[PDB]
Subunit: 154 residues, 3 copies
Amino acid sequence: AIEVKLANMEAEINTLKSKLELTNKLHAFSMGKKSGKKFFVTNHERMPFSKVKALCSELRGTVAIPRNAEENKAIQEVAKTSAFLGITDEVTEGQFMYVTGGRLTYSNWKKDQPDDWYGHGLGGGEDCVTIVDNGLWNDISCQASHTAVCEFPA
Amino acid sequence: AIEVKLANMEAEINTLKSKLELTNKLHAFSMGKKSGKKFFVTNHERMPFSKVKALCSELRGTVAIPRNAEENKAIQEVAKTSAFLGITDEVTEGQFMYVTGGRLTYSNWKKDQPDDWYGHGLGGGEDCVTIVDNGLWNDISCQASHTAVCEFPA
Amino acid sequence: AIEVKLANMEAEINTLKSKLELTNKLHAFSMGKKSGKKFFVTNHERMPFSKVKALCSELRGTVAIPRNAEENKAIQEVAKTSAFLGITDEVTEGQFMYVTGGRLTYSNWKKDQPDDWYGHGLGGGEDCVTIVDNGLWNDISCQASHTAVCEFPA
Ligand SMILES: CO[C@@H]1O[C@H](CO)[C@H](O)[C@H](O)[C@H]1O
Ligand SMILES: CO[C@@H]1O[C@H](CO)[C@H](O)[C@H](O)[C@H]1O
Ligand SMILES: [Ca+2]
Ligand SMILES: [Ca+2]
Ligand SMILES: [Ca+2]
Ligand SMILES: [Ca+2]
Ligand SMILES: [Ca+2]
Ligand SMILES: [Ca+2]
Ligand SMILES: [Ca+2]
Ligand SMILES: [Ca+2]
Ligand SMILES: [Ca+2]
Ligand SMILES: [Cl-]
Ligand SMILES: [Cl-]
């Protein structure tokens, strides 16, 4: 009895894992994941950078990071408003790095940006980055509230 | 063997619980759920009130109830068309209550509503409530078919 | 006692399997699945017929097939843009078959369709069926890229 039960239990668990993986694939598909491409998702909520980071982390994702034109376009299309990207220069002013470590290899800065502007009155300059409506980038205060767009691997 | 196998299964089960909780969180997020706020979902199907209640019940949710202007706005945004609300005066004519129990704490009745109208010919007056496109409320027959909008906890 | 722990673990597994079924029900609901009707879904990716077949298969579904006016509208609304239907006359020209087998029963052909055009510049004629934005059917090249829409049982 005991051993047959344990073997059935291993089989129940495995079937459950298989079904959940299928559920996850279907969910990604319905959320717009393109074959073999990393995908972006948003709840359309605006919040400070630290919150987006915390939120996406809780989802086992990361704050969206465009690595090329295609991805930048994908994020632009998903967000549809100013959205934080996983890029900051908090560690060393002027040096933008991915939250996932490493210096920028692809950029799409709007003209005259980044400018580490202080005029926002929120304190400090601008150490975070957002993708604005047309896909161009702007450095903004990490304390300002923008759309949360999380990224999941290909 | 046996006890080590059983101990691994506990770990396998626990890991599955966490993964499924993650899937639910991601699904809620993709469905527009805002942090710490209840969310509304619809499949855009129109059906009588009894059907909406059974449907939301099966999904472990409840028929959408606006507790304030914000939520009322969210529900109308989700439904897009006339939808039933979890409020009726079926227990005592004239006294609208939440299906979940209790008297109304917020209302957005359109002018000259509720009127417990009989002119619809479905029999009886009007004991159910629909939120019309412009966020306003109208009492309607529970037998009429309107959009099913379910609500899930904050 | 091992047996007792095993019993409790079996209970946990049952709770999890019901929880996953609920997750699947909620997702289908959020994606527009009507009660007792097939479920249609898309990731809004355009690709050749071969890829749509491959993708839907990986999800354990099939390329969307309208079998009546209702399903036709349902697919049209889901895809929003030209999508492939699981119908083709690849084998024998003029004999449209379902990817799931059998000769075409219900059809919603436009006037002058199917015409098996060749001048598209893709090689061959038109052996696939796309439900154009308007809802009507039009045969097209199975090499052209159209929206991927998969269906799942009622
Ligand atoms: C009109 O956009 C704003 O311009 C400022 C400069 O004046 C800063 O660059 C801000 O970051 C940017 O949001
Ligand atoms: C034109 O709207 C209808 O008006 C009736 C009164 O004439 C009732 O109030 C119905 O509930 C309402 O839907
Ligand atoms: Ca079994
Ligand atoms: Ca800076
Ligand atoms: Ca700036
Ligand atoms: Ca293992
Ligand atoms: Ca009444
Ligand atoms: Ca009325
Ligand atoms: Ca042919
Ligand atoms: Ca043909
Ligand atoms: Ca044609
Ligand atoms: Cl900052
Ligand atoms: Cl009624």
